[PDB]
Design an enzyme around this catalytic site. Structure first.
Site, PDB file in Angstrom:
ATOM      1  N   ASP A   1       0.874  -1.146   0.000  1.00 42.42           N
ATOM      2  CA  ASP A   1       0.000   0.000   0.000  1.00 42.42           C
ATOM      3  C   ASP A   1       0.926   1.214   0.000  1.00 42.42           C
ATOM      4  OD1 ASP A   1      -2.370   1.670   0.311  1.00 42.42           O
ATOM      5  OD2 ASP A   1      -1.790   1.822   2.452  1.00 42.42           O
TER       6      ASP A   1
ATOM      7  N   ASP B   1       0.082   4.838   1.029  1.00 42.61           N
ATOM      8  CA  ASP B   1      -0.061   5.837   2.083  1.00 42.61           C
ATOM      9  C   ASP B   1       0.146   5.246   3.465  1.00 42.61           C
ATOM     10  OD1 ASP B   1      -2.001   6.642  -0.295  1.00 42.61           O
ATOM     11  OD2 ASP B   1      -1.283   8.466   0.715  1.00 42.61           O
TER      12      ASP B   1
HETATM   13 MG    MG Z   1      -2.401   3.137   3.883  1.00 35.92          MG
END
Ligand code: MG
Ligand code: MG
Lengths: 396, 396
Positions: free
Chosen positions: B183, B185
């Site tokens: 992922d 962020d």
């Molecule tokens: Mg995230």
């Protein structure tokens, strides 16, 4: 915790020792920096490196708590200040495989003596197999610029003591091997297809002689191929399926390929033999890449020639390079396995080049040589143990 | 050699012991079946299992030669018949990682105690890192049908003692991990891009609140995405490059990716964020796969909507599956790393799902959790040591 302390427990292995030691250390200001523990043949070695308050280390209490707990149950323990001591040991630079049937004491003695002579420290020894052959691994630390001298010394030992000895880089990168190519004849498959074709022409004599002459490097591969295939001039092409159906895999081949699939290898074959025989087989073995030569056929009859371009010694290297580029695998992470002088350029191009029951011309330039008739000993050279193979296979 | 003999050397490590022992054994009929040797904190343990002639084993000479040679230089040695003794130890079933800063004795004690309670035998302990955090590995053998209970017990220990504890299958197959997705962020990148975009609209307040609400799983990801992107309605699209140029990688990210390339991993990112920000970055990091959402733009201005289809919680799993099919990697050999409830389906689809500084909703279903702000601790969970990273990086 501002001062370092080393605690070292040794003796006959009993259960609960590990937990007991750390339960004791928690009554002091103890934080862990490193733990190393093994049991070999019921001998416990537990080395613990900690930081603790300066006043705890300079007090008899920590010592007395540890010595009491450990000595009581029957083991020995030492406790001492550290501060200058390395926290975590450095990686081994190389690993060394010793395969034999048998491995005499004298053989392993000779290996360990060559290792010592070249300033090479032994970091670990373990068994990697008990069948089909005995296999031992030594992770070693080699002084820089000594590993050429090492492989050389260990090759002398290998010939003299009748064991296989392979020295390999134990770096992170160079040991994430991702792609392997096999030669087919007398490597993945038992015997020489071209001799099996020749027997159909009553020419196994002529052709066996030339093949041995070519695989020992005494002959140009292409002229040797042309002279051998010419003996087939006039055989019905039906002879190709006949021989294809007579091929026996090398002992350990299925195990070798299956285990390589588990490890997510790209698997291929690079041959100077014939595509109509090898492709049918490579499909069966679920291989990712094939390159072979091609028999000329006219009216369902072999002409005795091949249809260019000929895969020669150089062609094999070129095919490995091609395969590797396509798969996205750097040459250093590639493996090539062959048995003839045919394969010399291929093995030298590969990250790891393995000579399997090979002619002298190949053993002399191969990174590693195997002398036993089990193709799965290749797996030991790739860091796999017999136990791990057997475990994985039992999960089916 | 028809009878088996075990020889066990222990004591303070000196050079030449190994060679000496095998030089002695060669004067008897000795063939090797297994050798195990380690030195921990200057404690040698050398266990040798051999076959030898029945009359040699039943004679004092072999004993006296070995005991003389070893006792002389200062070490201890025992010699005994075997015959029933296992030749080569079985593989460990699992491995366990303990990461802490610090790792108290109490913490490790608690781990070792949970391990013992569930009939789990410890086969090996070693350090895997001394920075950025302390990391310890225990290769263990778990009774069948107990590893659920183990991960559970060790998760309780992890929360209570403030260390990361990860239990992983140590099988050949399941541990040849070949593909990883991050992922973006608060995982690969520091902070929340969507909040950085919102600050440009003077809305970081609204959006930070909703983002925390969504990443903790309290909100549908799509409605939460729609409410957050709407705050950007009317910003010039130039704001995308501005934020893209303000992104800092997570500490350890470059090291993590570089090491994964050495290991020949396929590397990808699966995000609910925005492609115009992530693709520019994924190209820089030389990633193999990107999937993100897409901002709607009209006349160079953001409208406040995304252009479907939305990558939702389910979409992330679908993208991992897609990536894996293309790369030719079975789901069991895939790794996913995330920090939000956004990532729950993805982590559970992956062979190994790692929660990185994650919200409760994710830690509860993740195979493994990391609580320290260094993304390279991921590497320790993949069987890599700090030493091996540092060595490989120094070869440049
Ligand atoms: Mg995230
Ligand atoms: Mg051959």
């Amino acid at each position: 915790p501002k001062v370092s302390v080393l605690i070292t427990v040794t003796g006959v292995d009993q259960p609960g020792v590990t937990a007991t030691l750390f339960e004791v250390l928690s009554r002091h200001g103890v934080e862990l920096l490193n733990v190393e523990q093994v049991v070999i043949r019921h001998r416990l070695t537990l080395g613990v490196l900690v930081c603790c308050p300066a006043d705890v280390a300079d007090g008899p209490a920590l010592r007395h708590d540890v010595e009491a707990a450990i000595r009581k149950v029957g083991l020995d323990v030492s406790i001492e200040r550290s501060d200058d001591v390395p926290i975590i040991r450095e990686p081994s630079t190389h690993t060394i495989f010793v395969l034999g049937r048998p491995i005499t004491a004298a053989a392993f003695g000779a290996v360990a003596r060559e290792v010592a002579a070249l300033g090479v420290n032994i970091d670990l020894i373990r068994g990697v197999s008990d069948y089909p052959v005995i296999g031992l691994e030594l992770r070693v630390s080699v002084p820089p610029g000594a590993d050429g001298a090492l492989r050389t010394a260990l090759n002398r030992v290998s010939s003299e003591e009748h064991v296989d000895v392979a020295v390999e880089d134990y770096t992170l990168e160079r040991r994430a091997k991702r792609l392997i190519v096999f030669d087919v004849d007398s490597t993945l498959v038992q015997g020489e297809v071209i001799e099996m074709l020749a027997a159909k022409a009553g020419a196994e004599g002529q052709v066996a002689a030339i093949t041995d002459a070519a695989m020992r490097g005494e002959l140009d591969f292409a002229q040797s191929l042309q002279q051998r295939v010419a003996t087939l001039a006039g055989l019905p092409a039906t002879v190709i399926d006949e021989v294809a159906g007579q091929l026996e895999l090398m002992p350990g081949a299925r195990t070798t390929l299956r285990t390589l699939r588990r490890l997510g290898y790209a698997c291929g074959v690079v041959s100077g033999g014939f595509r109509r025989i090898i492709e049918p087989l490579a499909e069966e073995l679920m291989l990712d890449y094939v390159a072979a030569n091609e028999l000329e056929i006219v009216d369902g009859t072999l002409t005795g020639r091949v249809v260019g371009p000929i895969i020669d010694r150089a062609g094999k290297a070129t095919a490995l390079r091609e395969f590797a580029q396509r798969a996205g695998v750097p040459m250093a992470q590639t493996v090539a396995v062959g048995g003839g002088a045919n394969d010399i350029d291929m093995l030298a191009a590969a990250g790891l080049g393995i000579a399997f029951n090979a002619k002298p011309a190949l053993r002399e330039v191969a990174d590693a040589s195997l002398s036993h008739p089990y193709l799965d000993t290749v797996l030991f050279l790739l860091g796999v143990t017999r136990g791990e193979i057997e475990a994985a296979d039992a999960i089916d």
